[PDB]
Design a protein around this ligand. Structure first.
Ligand code: ZN
Ligand code: ZN
Lengths: 56, 51, 58
């Protein structure tokens, strides 16, 4: 019965990794979009930032 | 012998899954707050930033 | 032979799972802190600038 249990556990752990992989992929994809958005904001503001702090 | 080892691996997976669920939940919640904050900021700069 | 072999392989898979994720978790905390710092600088610059130069934007 033990070998049966461990055989099944293999597929269960595989299922878990597949779930995890997708949840992570989605988190990272969103993280990626926030960075892109943030970077556009920083680029847009760069001239204003420099106007406040950097001569010439 | 092997029964106790397998039991211990079941518990490890259990703990790991639980750590994952809770920790990813805390990261997703913080990510939402960052999105909200970024959306406010962008609202100030529209429609200029989009153009 | 079959049983012991599965137990051995399973031990290794579970170790790998736990290590992989300790590593992913470290990258997240790092990228999230950096994102927060960047956003915070933007916010801290933009509020007083709006207030003093571009006031109707609010
Ligand atoms: Zn100025
Ligand atoms: Zn091990």
């Amino acid at each position: 019965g033990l070998e049966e249990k461990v055989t099944r556990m293999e597929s269960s752990v595989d299922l878990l990794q597949t779930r995890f992989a997708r949840i992570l992929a989605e988190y990272e994809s969103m993280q990626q979009k926030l960075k892109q958005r943030l970077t556009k904001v920083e680029k847009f503001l760069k001239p204003l930032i420099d106007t406040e702090f950097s001569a010439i």
